[PDB]
Structure 1
């Protein structure tokens, strides 16, 4: 969940990539994984 649901919408979007628009999914997905890494300000510090 989420950890793999975001990667499921990432690799599937990079499957039907006609031209070299792999860089465009590189933008939104690595932006999602750079933004959903901001949730590391919670959780136990252990």
Structure 2
């Protein structure tokens, strides 16, 4: 429930009060966050 869901907590909440079709602006901003979070696995045990 830390960052794994905290970034998803700020993602769905940002996609809640979307007036127009601004959900793509949230997607490009959140997919850029989760893709930069895929670089976190550069460390960690390889198994």
Band of TM-score, shorter chain: over 0.9
Question: Which residues of structure 2 form unaligned runs of 5+?
Answer: none
CA RMSD of aligned residues (A): 0.4
Q: Which has the higher contact order (CA 8 A, sep 6+)?
A: 1
Q: CA deviation at 1:26?
A: 0.5
Q: Distance in 1 between matches of 2:14 and 2:40?
A: 24
The size of the alignment, in residue pairs, is: 46
**Alignment partner of 2:16: what SS?**
coil
